[PDB]
Amino acid sequence: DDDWIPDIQIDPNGLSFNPISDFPD
Amino acid sequence: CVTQLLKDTCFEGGDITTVFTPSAKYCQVVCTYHPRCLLFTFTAESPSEDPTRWFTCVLKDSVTETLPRVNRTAAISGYSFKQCSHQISACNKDIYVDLDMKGINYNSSVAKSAQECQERCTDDVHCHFFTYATRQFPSLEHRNICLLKHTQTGTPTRITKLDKVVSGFSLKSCALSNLACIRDIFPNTVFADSNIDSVMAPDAFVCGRICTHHPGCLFFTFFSQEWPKESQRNLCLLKTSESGLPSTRIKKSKALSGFSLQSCRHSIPVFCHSSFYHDTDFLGEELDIVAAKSHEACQKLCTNAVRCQFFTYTPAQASCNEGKGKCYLKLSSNGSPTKILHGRGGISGYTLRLC
Numbered sequence: 001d002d003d004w005i006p007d008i009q010i011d012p013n014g015l016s017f018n019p020i021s022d023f024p025d
Numbered sequence: 026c027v028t029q030l031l032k033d034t035c036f037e038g039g040d041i042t043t044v045f046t047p048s049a050k051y052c053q054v055v056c057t058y059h060p061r062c063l064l065f066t067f068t069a070e071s072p073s074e075d076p077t078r079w080f081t082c083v084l085k086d087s088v089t090e091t092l093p094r095v096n097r098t099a100a101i102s103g104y105s106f107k108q109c110s111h112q113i114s115a116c117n118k119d120i121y122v123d124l125d126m127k128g129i130n131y132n133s134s135v136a137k138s139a140q141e142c143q144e145r146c147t148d149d150v151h152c153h154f155f156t157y158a159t160r161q162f163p164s165l166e167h168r169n170i171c172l173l174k175h176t177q178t179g180t181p182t183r184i185t186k187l188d189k190v191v192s193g194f195s196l197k198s199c200a201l202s203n204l205a206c207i208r209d210i211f212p213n214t215v216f217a218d219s220n221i222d223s224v225m226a227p228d229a230f231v232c233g234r235i236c237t238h239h240p241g242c243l244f245f246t247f248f249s250q251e252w253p254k255e256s257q258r259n260l261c262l263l264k265t266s267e268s269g270l271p272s273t274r275i276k277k278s279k280a281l282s283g284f285s286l287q288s289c290r291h292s293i294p295v296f297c298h299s300s301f302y303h304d305t306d307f308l309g310e311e312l313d314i315v316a317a318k319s320h321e322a323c324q325k326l327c328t329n330a331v332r333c334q335f336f337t338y339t340p341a342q343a344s345c346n347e348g349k350g351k352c353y354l355k356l357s358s359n360g361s362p363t364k365i366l367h368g369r370g371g372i373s374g375y376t377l378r379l380c
């Protein structure tokens with residue numbers, strides 16, 4: 001209504017997380 | 026159509042992508058719901074193959090809708106259910122014994138049984154599958170532990186065989202819950218959290234139904250046809266967050282955001298989108314140009330062509346032209362148009378293959 005600049009940059013990648021380790025054998 | 030699997034059979038060169046499923050029947054289910062998969066070749070566990078090659082489920086596509094069958098040890102091959110009139114449930118209520126299904130482990134708690142682990146995965150927003158250590162597991166550090174897991178595709182990245190441990194799948198798809206899929210609708214709002222994918226949608230309610238079926242989408246943002254930037258018009262941004270909720274609501278007009286109801290009313294209504302979009306051209310990869318009488322005929326042509334994902338009937342209209350018009354059968358990778366065009370006099374729609 002006063003100004004529109006395109007400042008939303010579509011960016012496809014994933015959600016981060018805290019690493020958890022697997023079972024060993 | 027073929028629902029029975031082909032024992033010791035290996036299809037040859039249709040590789041779209043390769044994902045890992047517990048069994049060949051699940052490999053079929055993944056194929057069935059994949060926008061382009063027509064065929065699959067699953068690699069069961071056998072001494073003739075190296076362990077790394079086990080549970081390989083190869084999604085295949087062919088212009089001829091079939092592929093060379095070579096015979097091969099411990100290979101189960103099969104065809105998708107895209108055409109079939111019988112339906113499936115896509116709900117894997119099975120729990121797999123001595124199977125480590127691997128993905129991004131994000132939670133690690135304790136649970137009385139695998140069924141408690143399952144109920145956790147089912148009720149967790151990010152969980153796709155779980156692995157639970159029975160009480161008899163070598164490592165006392167790990168006994169009775171519940172690892173909640175998620176992957177980009179919703180399927181495991183690698184499955185290995187590990188004794189005294191059970192894997193299983195989230196049962197969100199098993200719910201009934203006729204309730205609004207879009208749940209919270211946020212008009213004149215854009216969200217701004219991790220964009221994990223993007224598709225082109227005709228209206229905002231297709232946008233929502235896609236997010237509900239997308240493995241890793243929890244909320245979305247739809248830019249309308251009157252949105253300022255042309256490249257962003259009809260852009261369906263699928264987003265997620267670690268909380269499961271959006272972070273910030275930016276009030277911008279001509280954009281609608283919303284919340285997936287992940288397990289709402291959505292086995293196959295995004296696939297039953299029998300709506301006709303007039304003055305609307307669904308762009309894509311051209312598969313054929315047949316001629317027919319109506320858009321209702323164009324649709325039936327897309328439904329019966331198993332490789333057809335969407336269509337545009339360009340109506341001839343007998344103003345001064347012939348009565349028969351053109352039926353562009355189309356396709357893309359995501360199953361959605363690559364661009365929706367408004368004002369070029371076409372009647373567009375979606376395949377009813379899986380409806």
Ligand SMILES: *[C@@H]1O[C@H](CO)[C@@H](O)[C@H](O)[C@H]1NC(C)=O
Nearest residue numbers: 033034035093094095096097
């Ligand atoms: C398996 O091998 C080929 C496919 O590679 C097939 O044509 C043939 O009928 C089968 N052979 C036998 C003897 O089962």
Ligand SMILES: *[C@H]1O[C@H](CO)[C@@H](O)[C@H](O)[C@H]1NC(C)=O
Nearest residue numbers: 131132133134145148149173
């Ligand atoms: C799992 O445990 C983690 C670590 O304490 C916790 O952050 C999360 O809320 C738990 N989630 C479930 C569903 O158990």
